[PDB]
Ligand binder design. Structure first.
Ligand SMILES: C#CCCCNC(=O)C[C@H](Cc1ccc(F)cc1)NC(=O)[C@@H](Cc1ccc(Cl)cc1Cl)NC(=O)[C@H](N)Cc1ccccc1C#N
Ligand SMILES: C#CCCCNC(=O)C[C@H](Cc1ccc(F)cc1)NC(=O)[C@@H](Cc1ccc(Cl)cc1Cl)NC(=O)[C@H](N)Cc1ccccc1C#N
Lengths: 304, 304
């Protein structure tokens, strides 16, 4: 029993973190086989960051302008290329700690673990969701750029995020591992705004199912609702519309608890309309939306 | 910027997790140099668990009654001993992945990371505090026994917890790595109750300092209070008394924000008396008490 924000074990990713230096700028890189992946703004100065032309800045660099450190051992760069917003540095040594891995680009509402690093050295691990507005509410200080997000599936590491920048609101924006930003953002030091966020409805429902699995039932009721009437309420409270694909994803948890999805929607609706009234759910005084249906199944038991 | 429940990177501990089997009972073990550490109730049957005599049960066992698996490779047990509530199994192979490490017994209110494992295989990582009543609010399923809690300091792994059991309330109890339980608990399948818990005052204050560091100020006020008048309020709301050692621990955060400790106590008092009134602090609708002063400094920047 119990329910915690749980990250994947980070060891397979720890053995891939390196430090990349170009001029005075240092950030983190990801070392897989013989290629090091990092944000391309490592090739920028403070002046270049205002409005950079990266093709221009990179053509002015050679392999020896880049310093790669793995532990204390320095790696030799034998080639370099740019792919979207990530820099690829070919090195002379294949990383012997390279896990089985894939690059995947995730959908808003999916979760992943972040291994926050500074100067190539892992400092901590936490759980994140990709918000509907394509930012993440991370914990990142200067020098965290190049930290990656990932999921693990049977010793295959699926990398899905690389950290690039913090926006004026304090939230964070980055790319997939092929350098494509999540959301409309671009890698220049201009003030960019995220669109207004919404609550990840399917995740709030998964977490309500987690609460039932752990014996929390005070919020349930006998009422049920329709998909359409619930979505009217969702709109009113800035919740993502609930799709039928989302109803179907919640199937396993619905069956394991006996509570039909649209039955749980009536409880959420009532929770949205009446608040918690001082009570808590799984130790929280607000509705949590950074657990997917998959996260709940993985962490919870197969029996209530 | 940002503030997350952050665990230590788990890789150094991942390379130490093994599976220990005795009869039909399997749980997790910790493999350091040539010794495997695990809960002693691995030598129990379902019948033995009601009221075991462990010296009796262990004298009836030989080395070959214990199966140790590291990955798929089986380890050979060449000796065994009991120390308090942990079993020590000597094996023929020193763990080549043994980190620099120490065993430490922590105080209530301190935090640590848990690497939850099943059948010797790590499944996830999360942050925990030792509650004042010497339980932890973990996330543990059957088979998690032997999972360990740890802190990391400059590549030294300080192990401080081994998981043994879940109590009727759903919270969890375990030992230090020398087998001494935290709290009054014993390792038999009787219904034991934890004492009533209290809120970790010094940690709530550290977290309020975290909020200021991240630009959250709506809860501050101009009032200050005395240590004695605050402790009257603490008692009323089931908060640990605040000691002078605790005031002094909060020194660095006080200086970095300019807010004196007893100044922050007046804000906490007002928060305790008036509630949040719908607002949140670092994304939470209640006062968080599982971040130590040290956790806040480690995760936050040196400048507000
Ligand atoms: C609550 C709350 C808000 C608190 C105040 N928040 C900030 O002051 C962060 C601040 C906000 C901001 C945004 C646009 C601006 F015009 C001016 C300022 N963001 C940065 O200064 C950007 C500027 C930048 C560099 C490079 C590129 Cl490609 C894009 C961008 Cl936007 N620096 C970084 O993101 C570092 N790579 C990494 C870094 C540095 C410093 C602090 C954190 C990080 C991280 N992580
Ligand atoms: C909300 C809420 C509460 C929900 C209901 N909670 C439970 O049903 C857990 C249940 C509560 C309980 C306590 C005392 C009893 F008399 C009877 C039952 N606890 C267990 O069944 C103990 C019994 C036990 C075994 C060995 C020793 Cl040494 C001591 C103890 Cl007490 N089993 C374990 O702790 C496994 N080692 C590991 C394990 C098994 C199953 C589930 C979780 C775990 C873990 N982690």
């Amino acid at each position: 029993s119990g329910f915690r924000k749980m990250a994947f074990p980070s060891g397979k990713v720890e053995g891939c973190m390196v430090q990349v230096t170009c001029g005075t700028t240092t950030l983190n890189g990801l070392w897989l086989d013989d290629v090091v992946y990092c944000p391309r703004h490592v090739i920028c100065t403070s002046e270049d960051m205002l409005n950079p032309n990266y093709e221009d800045l990179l053509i002015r660099k050679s392999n020896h302008n880049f310093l790669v450190q793995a532990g204390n051992v320095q790696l030799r760069v034998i080639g370099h290329s740019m792919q979207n917003c990530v820099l690829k540095l070919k090195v002379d040594t294949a990383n012997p700690k390279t896990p089985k891995y894939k690059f995947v680009r995730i959908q808003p509402g999916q979760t992943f673990s972040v291994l926050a690093c500074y100067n190539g050295s892992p400092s901590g691990v936490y759980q994140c969701a990709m918000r509907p507005n394509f930012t993440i509410k991370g914990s990142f200080l200067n020098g965290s750029c190049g930290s990656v997000g990932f999921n693990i599936d049977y010793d295959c590491v699926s990398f899905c995020y690389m950290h690039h920048m913090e926006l004026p609101t304090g939230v964070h924006a980055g790319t997939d591992l092929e350098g494509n930003f999540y959301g409309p953002f671009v890698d220049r030091q201009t003030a960019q705004a995220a669109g207004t966020d919404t609550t990840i409805t399917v995740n709030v429902l998964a977490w309500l199912y987690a609460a039932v699995i752990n014996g929390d039932r005070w919020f349930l009721n006998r009422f049920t609702t329709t998909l359409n009437d619930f979505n009217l309420v969702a709109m009113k409270y800035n919740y993502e519309p609930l799709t039928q694909d989302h109803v179907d994803i919640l199937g396993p948890l619905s069956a394991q608890t006996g509570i039909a999805v649209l039955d749980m929607c009536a409880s959420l609706k009532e929770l949205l309309q009446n608040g918690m009234n001082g009570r808590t759910i799984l130790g929280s005084a607000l509705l949590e939306d950074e657990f997917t249906p998959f996260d709940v199944v993985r962490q919870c038991s197969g029996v209530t």
